[PDB]
Design a binder for this molecule. Structure first.
Ligand SMILES: CC(C)[C@H](N)C(=O)O
Ligand SMILES: CC(C)[C@H](N)C(=O)O
Lengths: 155, 155
């Protein structure tokens, strides 16, 4: 589908949701639907504000992070070192959203890191991951739209 | 410039502005910059919440509307009859944003009507107008992004 269709999908969701008690789970599921990727909305200190999983993986440490709603400390800290969107980061990147013990299995795993920003403040990070299919401009548009509005709905 | 560049321009503006006292003038100027068109954010009852003019026109009734920050009653009412974005509406459309006494002069004037919606409620209308150049998907994406976030910043 065309980009305008996908943006319309986010827009209808935003239009109906404003105002109800903010729903990051819903935003993550929407982005997952239009970007076709795993979605994690991660706070400054690693708290999962929302996520939506597009691939079930059999890694226990990963399943725990989602049950805990908490990403690792070091990994989460290091996300501040990416000041601007950085896309198509491969399995060997320190920023990969796939678990490192499974690099062999997820050799084609791609990660996109999107700073969530609001008031000149890095409020969090929106992480996108999936297998094999390179992220393109359209995915970035949708990703950044979502990160911007999440940055707003965080306030 | 690519769409992703233009969306980045709106995004930086939104990112710095949240939160300061909402600024519809700034939003209108931004959209004008990226869509290259006149921009009017019109309330349910015709109040100009914001505008940004890309073409100065010599029509006094129009200059008054902007000084008053109020569009006409009938015209404003009839905007509810457009439930979804309707673009590239010509000079002879009842929805035209050009003054009707100057139809001859503005024969190539095109208008796009974008419902501003929030909570299942039509909150207003975002109107785009310009001469000669047809609106395309990219303009609509930018227009609808802006209308959606205006619908939110109205709440
Ligand atoms: C999955 C993510 C948090 C990181 N690459 C890790 O392996 O812990
Ligand atoms: C400009 C607008 C409000 C309308 N077409 C009019 O002529 O009054």
């Amino acid at each position: 589908m065309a980009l305008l269709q996908k943006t319309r999908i986010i827009n209808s969701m935003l239009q109906a949701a404003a105002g109800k008690p903010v729903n990051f789970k819903e935003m993550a599921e929407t982005l997952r639907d239009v970007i076709d990727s795993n979605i994690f909305v991660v706070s400054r200190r690693g708290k999962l504000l929302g996520y939506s999983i597009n691939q079930q993986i059999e890694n226990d440490r990963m399943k725990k992070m989602l049950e805990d709603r908490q990403f690792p400390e070091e990994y989460t800290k290091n996300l501040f070192n990416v000041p601007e969107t950085s896309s198509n980061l491969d399995i060997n990147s320190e920023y990969t959203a796939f678990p490192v013990e499974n690099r062999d299995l997820f050799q084609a795993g791609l990660t996109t890191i999107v700073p969530i920003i609001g008031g000149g403040e890095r409020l969090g990070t929106l992480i996108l991951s999936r297998l094999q299919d390179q992220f393109n401009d359209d995915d970035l548009i949708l990703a950044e739209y979502g990160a911007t509005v999440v940055g707003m709905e965080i306030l």
